[model samples]
Target: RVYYINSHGTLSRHENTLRFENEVKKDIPVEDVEEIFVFAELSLNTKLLNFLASKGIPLHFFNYYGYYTGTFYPRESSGHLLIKQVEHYLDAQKRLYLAKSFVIGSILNLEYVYKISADTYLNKVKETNSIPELMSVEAEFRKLCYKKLEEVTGWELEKRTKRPPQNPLNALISFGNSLTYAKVLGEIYKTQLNPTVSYLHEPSRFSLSLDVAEVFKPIFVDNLIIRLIQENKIDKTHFSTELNMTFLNEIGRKVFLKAFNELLETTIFYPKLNRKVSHRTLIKLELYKLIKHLLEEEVYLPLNYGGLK
Candidate 1:
């Protein structure tokens, strides 16, 4: 389980132990921790940071408003693996092939959210010949998916909005998307692939993780929001509105985090590997598959709700 430090205080390492706050101390195996999320106004010394790096544990930082800031990545162990990745990016056809695969994967998984058997959206993505065309198709699919969400949950999400989501449902989606991106980023830290070199999304320092996350957001985050509201764990009251901007308050964040973490930790059967894996591990495994594709060991395929074939 990931340790969330939300109290404003100091974090330090002493005698190979992690201590948080001035008065409270606990003895837990640092290696057993999946990751450390710092959301409070806290101070940390170099010793603790060095210890975390030694253990190869990532430290995720969030702002006061709960938006993810960035991660403190340890020196990458797979520093030698980026040559082939650079080569693939230099080849136009190869880049486009992988980009299209991500879009196709996203459409298929989005369709599955509404329990639809139709591939009309998939066909649109397959027929797209340019980035603009692919983006248009993706937007249309997003609208359809959100509409389906409204019907399935009987929630009043008439339209999607961001940049301070106007509605409670929109706020929930924004929050969930941020958390999903953070989770994907953490998975990327364990791989040889550079998160900056990506397909589909505009190449940035972290776009590759965004590319991988697109296919799973609907499968995981969107569905989790629906399930939470349906289970009465979430409501409009959980959100706070300020100056026409709506967001989840502290109570809502805590509730959402509990459910979101549970979703990531949930195990699903993998048909191809013939084993079960947590949703979190699926992201890392997808990166491994992408590396294999980059190395010409296998064709690149995007992950789906039904698992990779």
Candidate 2:
């Protein structure tokens, strides 16, 4: 049983069963449990973890806003990892390298899509000594990406705004980002990475998911949103506004999901894999590549959705 919990609750043992206490107490079928995914602010202790480990059940975690944090897994389960995750995080040079790797990962992603040269930004990122400056370069390149989208998406997405997005394009991106985060969390849950001890986006909840999601957003959300606009699938009427806040109404969200979900099922020929993989499955492949890199098996490389000639 792959049980999922998305409530702000506390999970504990009540007799031989596991109970999650929220507005109401819910009992988890401990014996039937195989794995668990959490998208809530959940609280638990080592006692509960010991039970989970002893039972060979792993629990994946995400924050309240749907960002991935970490996982609780038995050491005998994955067979090799997590201290490596923290060891990577605790070492200064290693942290910076992995952090910049996320930057270049996204840089190459947009580069492939737009046919833009961010080689200079790549150089700047390589020389970056701190996260703030790395993020500064990211800001610069993302602005360039938005401007390029103005041509393809045929919308004036001059600046990105959120927390009640002010425009149609921003609304689409905000909503899509939430979907991307959740999707990445699902893929990461199947892996051994610790979502909280991330390299690029700080040690924020699911920061690793944020870093990984950053790599996939161009293909997953950006392309889809542009297609939705260029094809006249989404427009101003799809959004509802209140007090200067604009967002997708129920119909709009449905419209977006129909295309978004379908796109994830779209297949592409991946040269490295030497086979076709659906867009959704590619995220997991990306994580696997990262695992090898994390374990020092090989250097990591990000996805190039534009198939090589």
Candidate 3:
């Protein structure tokens, strides 16, 4: 059970104080529980962290913007000897391949978005034969996605400027990427797979979230952002103009986040596991599969659709 507070305010758990743990909730087996993620405005007394430590449960924190700030995992979890060896494997080639796969997946999903659009971007993607080739295709598609903003609101984008996004479409792109990064992180957490021990996304960056997000941007965020534009759900009305850039209004942020959350929780299948799973779950399984490969327990190959079987 996880608790989240999406707004800014003090989060005080009065009756749930750790001091009353044995009184209010008797005979509770503390070893059975796991971690908690708090996403809203919250207040926690220090004793709570101390009690949780006695029970071996961690607490992770996130701000209202859904950005991860920190965690309170006990130092004991960090002391596992076998886990240390996993940390030693964070090399360049492994991380890049992981990151590359995710970037490629997102680009492919962007192609799906273009297919739903009335533009020629989807055709451009279908012709892509390799990652290098898709990079060009993605550039073209980005230009098209941006062009829609100019057509609708007469806005133009400058590359790598002080303001990240010059228009509404750019805001969509930026937020889509954020959602993508987070989906990977969340899924990775569920598998008990150390996000730090990632394939393709390097461990040196200290951004395990990026490593996990590599596989999910396309399946969720990018395609959804494109749908919002193609369906006319996001436009000038959803943004506020400031400092020569268009940014998401409070309403726009709500809409994007809602859609992203729904998409993240959507389900898929795992043939190897012989069960239905969320695309979210598949990511965690992907990590476990990688672990198996690393331990020489299995031959790891990524799953893909086979002629719509």
Candidate 4:
């Protein structure tokens, strides 16, 4: 189970048990906290890590905007393995191959998402002739996708901003994608997987999470964002479109976060693993796939299909 403590909230541990500062106080057994998400200011010491480490727990932090801050993880036997992979990432050939792989995976996933949308004229995404060809189509599709946005709403997408989305739908998707990317990164760090040794995404000076995000953006955030729009879970009025950026308003933020959190908690069937899993569980599974690749137990094949079957 995951424990979430808001920034202003106070948490105290006595003999390894937890108590909240709020009037709704109770002792929470540390054993049940698999991961702790702190969204506001928190107080803890190395002793906290030591205790959590004993239980194999991790602590992940985020800001009020849902931006990922960092992680406090236990030093495990996997650290040496992760270090070796980081060294491998420095190899010129390995870096290029992984980088190309990452971009291609993201493009393919983007194309898949585009195909599922209602825009028929731009829906020829599945028939692209080659990787380069698909990338070109992806570019063309992105331009048209933005144009379609303008047609649907008289507003244009903003040039750049991290949050405060310019349009309601884009805002929701951005919010969802941000959370998705953070969760993916968190999973990578936890499994002691060499995120740098990626299959699709290319590694740069940046962290290895970029590689993993490519594969899931479509399957999780993009498709779901489009579906939410089509279903009217969020609408144009819920966003603020200005100067090329689209973002959620206050109410929209609440709605999007609520839905996104629920999405994270929900479970699904995994055909290869032959069991049910949460959306969060899939991140760990992806890390397992990476481990298999590194250990030579399995080949790293990025999931391109939409369905488990």
- Candidates ranked, most accurate by TM-score first: 2, 1, 4, 3
In terms of lDDT, the poorest run of 10 residues in model 1 is: 74-83
Q: Put down candidate 3 lDDT per residue, 56-144, tens digits, no spaces.
A: 66777877665678888875532342363264355444434444444444444444444335235445545555446645665665566
Worst 10 residues of 3 by lDDT: 19-28
Q: How far in Å is the alpha carbon of 191 misplaced in model 4?
A: 1.8
Kindly report which residue stretches of model 2 are placed more than 4 angstroms away from their true locations once superposed. Answer: 1-80
What total of clashing residue pairs does each candidate reach? 0, 2, 13, 21
Q: Each candidate's lDDT (Cα)?
A: 0.79, 0.82, 0.56, 0.62
lDDT of 3 at 11: 29
| Model 1 misplacement above 4 A | 1-80, 307-309
TM-score of 2: 0.75
Task: Please give each candidate's TM-score.
Answer: 0.73, 0.75, 0.59, 0.61
**In model 1, what lDDT does residue 205 have?**
72
lDDT at position 138, candidate 2? 92
Report the lDDT tens digits of candidate 4 across residue range 117-219. 4244234434544445445655564565455544544444543235555455556557777777777876765555655454333454325676677667766
What ordering of candidates by lDDT runs from best to worst?
Answer: 2, 1, 4, 3
